[PDB]
Every structure is written in C-alpha cells, then in structure tokens.
Symmetry: C3
C-alpha cells in the first residue's frame, strides 16, 4: 500500500501544480479582457475558492492515510 | 483502504472541478479571440469530449471500488 | 487492490489530458497577448516543465504499483 499512497501524493502534487497554472491562465484572461463576463468572473471565483478548499482537504486526507500506513 | 478510496474520491472531485474551470477558460479565450485557431478549436473540442468521457468512467470505477469496499 | 490501482491510472490519464488542454489554453493566451506578462511567462514555463516531469514520475510509480500487483 505504500506505493499506492505515494501515487496519491504524486497525483495531489500534480493537481496542485495544475491549479497554480490554472490560476495564471485565469489571471491572463482577466488581464486581456480589460456581455457575459460578469457572470464568468463569479463562476471562476467560486471554482478557485472551492478547489483551494478541496486541495486542503485532500492534503489532510493524505496525512491521515500516511499516518495509518506508518502506524 | 477506506481512507485510500476516500482520497480517490477527493482527487476525482478536484479533477472534475478543475475541468469546470478549464471549460470556462476555454470559453474566455474563444470569446476574446472573436491563423492556427481553427486547429486549436478542433483539438480543444476533442480534449473536452475525451475528458468528459474519462470523468464518467472514473466515477463508475469509484462506485465499483466503493461497492467492493462496502461489501 | 486492482480496482484502486486501475482508478489511479484513470486519474493519471485525466490529469495528463487536462495538462494537454492547459498547454493549449496557455498557447491561446500567448497568441492573444501578442506589464507583468514577462513574469507571467516565466512562471507558466516553470509550471509546464515541472508538471511534465511529475507526469513522468507518476507514470513510473503507476508501473511499479502495477508490477507489485501483477507479481
């Protein structure tokens, strides 16, 4: 199971890095933009906040899984 | 294994949410755009369709894993 | 554990496909862009390189996990 848990850490790191890149693409689009943009912004803001929260929760679950593994 | 299966659900939720954000960034780029854009669109369309299909398959696999766990 | 390992492959495939889509959105933004863009580019380049490396590492870990499973 150590390999499976390690793979989950690698996937978590990948999703975290992809979120960093997504944040940059959103910044880029907002910078180029300055219709339906008002609502676009509201949705993007919700997703960014929600994903950030989910990453934190996934990190906590990773730690619990590692704890149960190490114990 | 319950924690590992739960972590897979959290990663699936993260990728799903990131796809929602990606769909919005693609919408934003298309809106700003209106060269090599014709082919860019074809590739983006393929990826969006393929990822959507993969998310469905991952959800089904998650359910099967949860079933085997619960049983 | 076969189902869990298979689910990790599905998540890896999802993240890989999302990276392909992210690469396209970055290309699109760069094409539309032509301030803080110089640094934006430096950060995006770092993330693209780092994520590519992480995908390779995740693929290797997937293979090791599958090996231990098959053996």
């Amino acid at each position: 199971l150590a390999g499976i848990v390690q793979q989950q850490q690698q996937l978590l790191d990948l999703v975290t890095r992809q979120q960093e890149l997504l944040r940059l693409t959103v910044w880029g689009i907002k910078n180029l933009q300055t219709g339906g943009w008002q609502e676009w912004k509201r949705k993007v803001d919700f997703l960014e906040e929600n994903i950030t929260a989910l990453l934190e929760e996934a990190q906590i679950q990773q730690e619990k899984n590692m704890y149960e593994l190490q114990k």
